[PDB]
Structures are given as structure tokens and as C-alpha cells.
Amino acid sequence: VDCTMYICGDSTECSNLLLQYGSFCTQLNRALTGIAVEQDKNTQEVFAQVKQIYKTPPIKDFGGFNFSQILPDPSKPSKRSFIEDLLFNKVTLAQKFNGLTVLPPLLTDEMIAQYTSALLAGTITSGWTFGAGAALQIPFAMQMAYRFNGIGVTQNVLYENQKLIANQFNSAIGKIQDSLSSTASALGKLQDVVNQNAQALNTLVKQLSSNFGAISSVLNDILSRLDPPEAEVQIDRLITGRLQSLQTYVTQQLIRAAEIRASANLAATKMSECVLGQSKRVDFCGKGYHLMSFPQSAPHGVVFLHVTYVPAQEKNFTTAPAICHDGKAHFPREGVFVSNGTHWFVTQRNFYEPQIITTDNTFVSGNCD
Amino acid sequence: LSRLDPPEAEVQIDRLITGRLQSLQTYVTQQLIRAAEIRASANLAATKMSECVLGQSKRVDFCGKGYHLMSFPQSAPHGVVFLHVTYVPAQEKNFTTA
Amino acid sequence: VDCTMYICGDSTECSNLLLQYGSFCTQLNRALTGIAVEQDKNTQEVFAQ
Amino acid sequence: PLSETKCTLKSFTVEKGIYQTSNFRVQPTESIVRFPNITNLCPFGEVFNATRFASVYAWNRKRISNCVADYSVLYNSASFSTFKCYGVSPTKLNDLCFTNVYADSFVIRGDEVRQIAPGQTGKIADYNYKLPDDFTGCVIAWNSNNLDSKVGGNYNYLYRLFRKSNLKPFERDISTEIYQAGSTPCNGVEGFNCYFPLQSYGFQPTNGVGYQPYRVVVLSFELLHAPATVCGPKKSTNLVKNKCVNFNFNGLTGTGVLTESNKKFLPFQQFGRDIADTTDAVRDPQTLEILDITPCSFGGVSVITPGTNTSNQVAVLYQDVNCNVFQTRAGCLIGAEHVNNSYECDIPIGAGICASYQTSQSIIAYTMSLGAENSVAYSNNSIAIPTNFTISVTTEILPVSMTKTS
Amino acid sequence: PAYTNSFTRGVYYPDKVFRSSVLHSTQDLFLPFFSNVTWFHFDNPVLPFNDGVYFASTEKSNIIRGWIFGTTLDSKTQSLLIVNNATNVVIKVCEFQFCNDPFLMESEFRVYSSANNCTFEYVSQPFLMFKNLREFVFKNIDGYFKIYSKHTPINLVRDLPQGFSALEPLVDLPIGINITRFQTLLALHRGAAAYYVGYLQPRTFLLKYNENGTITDAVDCALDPLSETKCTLKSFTVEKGIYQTSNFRVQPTESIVRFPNITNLCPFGEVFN
Description:
Chain B: This is Spike protein S2'. This is part of a larger assembly, with 5 copies of chain A. By secondary structure, chain A is mainly alpha-helical. Chain A contains 12 helices and 6 strands. In chain A, the strands form 3 sheets. Chain A has a two-stranded antiparallel sheet with strand order 1-2. The first copy, chain A, has a two-stranded antiparallel sheet with strand order 3-6. A two-stranded antiparallel ribbon of chain A has the order 4-5. In chain A, a hairpin with a 4-residue loop joins strand 4 and strand 5 (344-347). In chain A, helix 3 packs parallel to helix 12 (232-276). Chains in contact: A-B, A-C, A-D, B-D, C-E, D-E. The interface between D and E is large, with 81 and 74 residues.
């Protein structure tokens, strides 16, 4: 807000009534432009946890896993990506005129996607090495296998069921544009946070039809219709409600302002954990056991894509927490024991595969009874 | 109140008294989202306050980048000045599995 | 909180001068009613599990 | 441009990074004037005191258009005393151009000049002359003491005196028997409670100054909805494009560049606005074309800094100013030897463009870098085993409490 | 008597100040949508203003020759005239006598009853030359008089056509005879008529002006609780939800005044008697 032209506009004596008078709209700027640097800083650490582009490899031959929805592609102007094509027409909006201004953001919407294009590469390329530093090689199929050992899934099964994972993963990715190709209200929190600024700008401008005890709502009539060594009183009250409306607008922005950062620090932390590191904390990024994520662009936010390991098709098997054999206990290394009513078996916690009760899978201690 | 008369001072007093406590309005908002910036940094202190400190738990990227040793705490406000010993290995070999 | 019931009451000239301010009334509700959905979504996002 | 936020934080020292400036339009030149061609200046003979402006229940109507409107051609034709303007400025009238203009004469009594106003209450209020509150124009009475004052009482106009109830606002009324207020009706016999509202005047100059008549013009004019050509007398100039100049198209000013369009604008409709309350399409009434006011305010500026005490040479980021320059993607990067190497970031610009002060020497900018992407052993029958130590720690501070308030 | 639905008509500009594509609101007087209307025909009785006139004429007829906006019908409570002389809008403001039923090979001139006390005479371009349909707006508070109309041929000769249309500022007049009642004017040549008179009252509207600055839609702030929400979100289309908009209470009726027990007993009256 350029302050004086919001209050008075192009008038000497209205400004010369505004200068017995310290530093309101000075400090109102230093209020507002003080926040103005910070959203760019909020834009800063919410993506820039890397230090240049990882270039995705030109061959796209990753074990059958399709990825044609999340990379950028030069069909568009070389930078936007495929889900984001569906995105950036689904949030539509003020103007430049009297009183106000709109500075641009620090980074541009073309190059917000530039860091995202970087991030998807390395987490396909090398995985969570590049959260640390230099990044060793990994091929994507065995990393996913190495990824399942975080949540106790015995990592044979990903080698053992490589093909079945593929099309389920692929069609789930195509489902997420299907979840947004028609219409969702779930764009939502993006849509209003632009919209509530617009009405806030609109309720800023709509103030200026006020009379506030004066006989006008324009400036120059007070100059014209009555006498400037008496009608400055008619200016005098007209200042302060406009000063109040500016005072409210700086206020009611400021409450929501760092409320965004308080949301955004949560946003960057999920960008910190759930993009880089295969976390353990449950119910934190998507419903289910966390596997990995893939982030995209947004007009003023970020949209994550998560991936969760969801169990299905349970079959209750008869269990017992202890085996005695020659008077000694037998406790499983992980998982528990099951039986199909007939013979006992050994498996892990979260995927069914029986084995044979061995010396290997167990260890002994203590007496029996 | 003294020089201006309450008929034509009342539109001056209209947004004088009504506007003055709109300026710690400024201040407390400036306070609490530095305070809640630390009231959650309390929790961010609580992230590595005790977990890799009183004893040891086992979360990647919550005991510092590296597999953690222990701590020895000292006094501060907005502080307790840790030395979180996390074991990122530096130099890389191989041994040839079979 | 009503704007008009809190300022005015059994008067009209009260409200007639208030119509000079008229943005200020509906200013306050969207502040306060916004708290109401804010409180509800908190009670949602805690126990909608 | 490095010295532009020392005073924004109001201090004799500036830090390192990237700051902001004042605004960016592109440098303005001129102020064009565009008025339609009507030869006629508006004649003010038979509106302002010519010979006879009759009844308080009958005004001399003339539909006034097809002429150039001006305000300093009144004071000659009558003996004015009172100028009382609403909805409009009293002297910005040749700074404008109206739509569907009127100049509207009548006469008042001298004791009750006061309630000729939008609703002063008393005996001035249910039997004559009535218009809603939303009226834009002036109210003009004048001195006149010669022609409307005879030697035997002025019997030259009626006034209606009685009426029951209230109304909506704007009309006229004939019909004319003996009035009935309450009981004992009239039916054209003039009984009791059947009042005789047509009651003799006493307008004489021997009667006092409060008992004189006052002829009143109330001016009536409106701003730009029908296409009108009534525009004032401050004569015309050329018409320009691709620049931001002052204009005046039929009474709405603005600030913007006139660019061309191709649309089928319905040809009886003067101006327009788009979705977010700004005028998009402007008509000129000479050549019959529609121009689009592209708002000439367009631009943003930045400046890459290390400060004053350290140095005094610049690196520029003219952000939305089109362009030793180079061109990176958060703005036009001058003061900036664009190098081809790659190092860490000190002052970022965007898309991995950062600037710093490296190796007379000038501030340089560049593209940033991840580190050594290499190719170490992939043998199937190998695994990687670290064993050495030279011990120290990896620190962080962590915050416990802070300040309270009252 | 002969009520018909007042569908959509009864609009006008408050004045002509420029605003386009902006949903704007004022506090003025307008036609309540979905109300009755006075369909009157052979017989033309007098009509009181009744705090409302929205006139509408009929088609198939150039027969209507203006109006008798009225008080009492003689020459005693000062006068109007609005006619058409088949070429021009003749406005006398002359004081004509008791033409309670004035009518007109051209038969005319029964309405000319007393040509005395003429104080305004007027000639301009005529108001109107499946036939064009006339509608008008008729009121009084502090000043002038309107002429607001638009004319369109349509079917449905007697009943009101639906569809929404603006009205236009034609002809505006500071005359000076504040109104009790009214009556019409027609003709004959040598009386089977139809017309409508509406009613307006103070009521907030929300107005749509088009992309070009012309009325295309409006709503009412008292017709339903639906448009009440439209009257407070400044928009036509609102979203599925819930909107606190306005408030009510219960009005007082008796307004009692209660005071302590009587007879503190001044002995003032003893010196009088």
C-alpha cells in the first residue's frame, strides 16, 4: 500500500494535515513489506532443499513402472508437468488502479516447477542419498524392495511380485487425474486463500464510499464546496476512518499472514520428511504405512502424491505366543506363530508367508511353564 | 478535548480513541508468532530433547542424520545446548559379499 | 456477535449513522463466523480418525 | 539502486541479497484531448429569465441536447444569488461530459426558500413538487423583482393546497374538484369539510423581502450510460496508441494504454467494464472505433546487494523491466558478468540462478550445482564397509521457553 | 379485482452514473415481484395512488391518449395535461374542468372543457408511433416527474408477458402538483380498453448491469430467504452451504409507563376556591 495516495491522493493540504504526525504509514509499510519478504522466504525452504537440477535420464525404462504423469515434458513450454496441466486452469481469480499494487513473487511459476522437476529425478534416480549429500547409484526396482524393509515387509516379496505391483501402481496414478478431471471441491484450501484476499481487497476499496461524518465521499468537493480555512475539519475526520480501514487491513492480513507460515513450516517439513526420507511416523503422509512421495507444483501451495501400503484380504489363523519343546521356550525373531488348525507355521507381522519352525527363526531362553 | 469542541471534535474523537488499542494489536501478533514460533520450537526442542538423549530410540532423521550416540545437557533460555553425536560415516570401502 | 444489536438497539438514528460505516458490520462477522468453522474443523481433524 | 533500502530500513548500512525499489511504469509523455464535434454551444435564452417562466405547477420544458455543455454561460442572462450543487463538482463541469442533461426552471416563495431541499419538513411537503433523494445537479435561484409583481395582487398562478397521504418519488397530477379531507363529502356542491384550496396570493414589492417570489433553476445531469455527444468546450487533439497519456472520452478519465481489439461491440452502448471492476472498452465518438484501455501500470524492479561499507558496485535485477546485461529468470540481470562456471549459492535469483561476488572485479551470477555425481562399483558380489574415526560432534541449539506478555 | 402476476417488470435507473458488470445495490423503490396488478379495461374508474403506480398499457391500440393523474375532477386543485395530437406529445398544463369521462371524420375535443389558465404548453417528438407495449413509472418525493418506457410487440395480448427488460430515462419534469389519485385517458372516433397499474415501495435491490452498462437482471431483498443471501454475498450464484445474513426480534406493542402511587396532594386549589 502506498499510504498517502490511499489516504489522500494527489493533494498537498491533505498530506499537510498528515504531518504533525510521526510514522504511521511508514511503519504500516514496514509492517506490510516486512511480511512481504517472508513468503518468498517461505517459498525458499519449502522447495530448495537441493542445490541444482538433477536431470532425469533420457531413457524411461524403470522396471515397468510408468511415470508419464509426473515428469515435465516438452509438449508444454518445456517446464510444466502432466498433472500440473490439469492443475493450473482450476484456480481462477484483483486489478491495478487507485490506491493499490501487486508485487510479483520472487520465483516465477515456470521455475517453481524447476525445483520440482529436479526433486522427482533424484528420488527416482538415487533415492534418499540426496537428502544427505553425494548420491550413489540405485536402480528403481531394487530400491522399492529396499524401501519395504522400513515397514517390516520382508523384501523378497517385491522381487517376488514385481509385475502385479506395476499396473496397480500405474492405474492408481492415472486415477488421481481422474479424481480431479471432472470437479472436486477439494481444491478448496487453495481456492479460498486467493479468494479471501480478493474480497479483502474488495472490502478495502469499498471503504472509500464513506462519509464518516462528512458531507462527501470524494476529496475535491470538500475543496470546492466549502472554505479551506474552515472545511479542513471536513477533511480532518475523513482521514481517520481511512486510516482505520488501512489499520484493519494490515491487521486482518497479519493474523492470516504468519498463519500461512505456521501452516507452511508444516508443509516444508513434510517436504523435508516425506519426500526425502522414508519415515516411520504413522498417519503423517497419507492414510496407511508410508512408502514415498512425489511432489508437484501449485499456484501458491504444493500438492503431494503419497503412496501407502494397505493390507487386504485377512484370514484369521490360530495363534499362540510360545512354543515349548524339550522343556524350553521358543520365541520368534519377528512376527508370531500361526497354525491352520493343523500344523504350526512362522510368518512376519504384515504379509502372509509361512515357513517352518527352525532353530533359525527363533531363539530360546527361560524355563517352560 | 480542550481546544476542539465536542460537537465538531466528536468526528475527530470518532477514530482517535477507537483506533489507539489497534497498535498493540500490532504488538501481540508480533509477539505470539514469535512465541508460537518457539512454542513449537519447544516441540522442535522436544524433537531431540530426550529421545536420542535420555537413552536412545531408533528413528531415521529424528536422532540427527546418523545413528546416534548420546548427550550432556546444560542451561539456557530458548535453549539447551546439545551435542547430538550422529554417526554419518565419512570414507567409503567395500567388502565383497557372497 | 451482531454488529447492530451491540451498537444500537431501540433506535434508528443510531443505525442511520451506522449506515455511513456499513462495511464495518459485515467486516466483523466474516471474522467471527470464520472462527466458528475454525473451531469445528479442529474438532473434526482431531477425532475424525 | 543499491542505495535504495538503506532508507527503507532508514539506516546508513545495507545488507547482502536482493532488495526492492520504487515502481515501474514506462516513462510517460503526453495528454491527448478528445471531444465530439457539435458546433452548437447551448443557447441559454429561454431557460434563464427571458420574459415569463410560468406556474409553480407548470414549468417550461425544453429537451436540451445536441449542444456543447458549459457552465460559465449563465451569469449574464439572470441576476443570480444562490448556487447549490449536488452529485457533482460546481466547477469540474467543463472537465466532464454528461449524459441526458437537463436545465430545469421554476419559482419559489421568499418566506419558504428553506424547505426547497430533499425533505425539510413543514408546510412545504404534500400538495406540489416531488423527486427522489438520488439527484445529481445544481439548485439555482435568482433575483427578480420587476415583472412578477403587479399593483392589485398576483392572480397569475394557482397552487394546489390539499392531499391525504404519501407517495413513491417522481410525478404530476390534474384532477380538480373541491377537496375532501374528512367527513361530509362534496360531490360538487362545496359543503362543509369541503375545502377551497385555490386561495389568493399577495406577492407585491411593497410586501417585504420575505414576501417576494424567487425563480429557481435546478440543473440536472448524469454521467455516461447512454451514448451522448454533449461534451464540453475544451477543444480537440489527435489520438494515439501504444503509449500511456491523459485522455478524456466523454467524461471518464483513466490511466492506461489504448490497444486494438476485434470484437463485435453492440453499436448503441457507450462504454463497458470486465469481471473485476475496471473499464475495459472505451468508445470514441469520431471515428467509430472501440479502444481497449490496457492499464499502463506494468512492472517490477529488484537490485542485488552486498552493501555500502563493503563496496559500491552493483548487480541489477530489473524484474519486470524488459531487456552488462544478462537475462535470467527472476529478472533482467545487469551489473552482472554472467559466467559459465558453477559454484554454491550466495544470492539466489531463480531456477538455480544465484549471484555472488567472485573473480576490476564485478558481482557475477551463474547457475548453481549439486556436487559430484559419479560411478562407483556395481559388482553383484560386493557391499560397502566403513571403519575409521577422528571424532567430533554435529551440533544444533534447541529452544525451551520464551517471553510472556501483559 | 382482475389480479394478475407482476412477474419481472418495474425497474429503472436511480440515475445514469457509469458502472458496468458490477452487482450494485441502492435503497430505492421498486416493484415487488410476484404480486398482484390492476387489470382495468368499457369502464375506466378513478384510482387512488395507494403508495404505488407502475403503469402498463396494452397493445392493439393507439387509443390511449395519456393520463388523468388526479385529485377530484373539476377545476379547483391545480392541473396537468398529457395527450398526443396524433403528431406530437402535447402537454398542456392548463386548468380544464370536470372531464371525468373525456372521450374523443376525426372526433376529438371533448376533453377541452375550460381553456382558461394555461401556464405551460409543450410540443416534442411523440412517445410512440402484435403491437408496441407501453409501461410507465409514476410517483412524488422532493422535486420532479419521470417518463420511463420501452415498447415491444409480443403475443399474449391481455396477460403480462414474462421476460425481463430495462426501462429508460426519456423525459424528466419539474412540474409541481403533489398527488392524491389518478385515472386514464383514451379516445373514440365516429371504449373497450385494457391496462395495468402496479405498485412500488422502499425496498433494497441488487442490480446487474451488463458488459455494456445496461440492466439485464435484478433481485429483491424481501421476496424469499434465498435472495436475502444474494443480498448479502453481493452475487447471484451462491454455493451449497449456510449463511448468517440478518436478524429479527419482536416489536413492542403497548409501551406502558408506570409511576409511584398517586396523591402527594398539593393544597394549591384551596386558595382558588
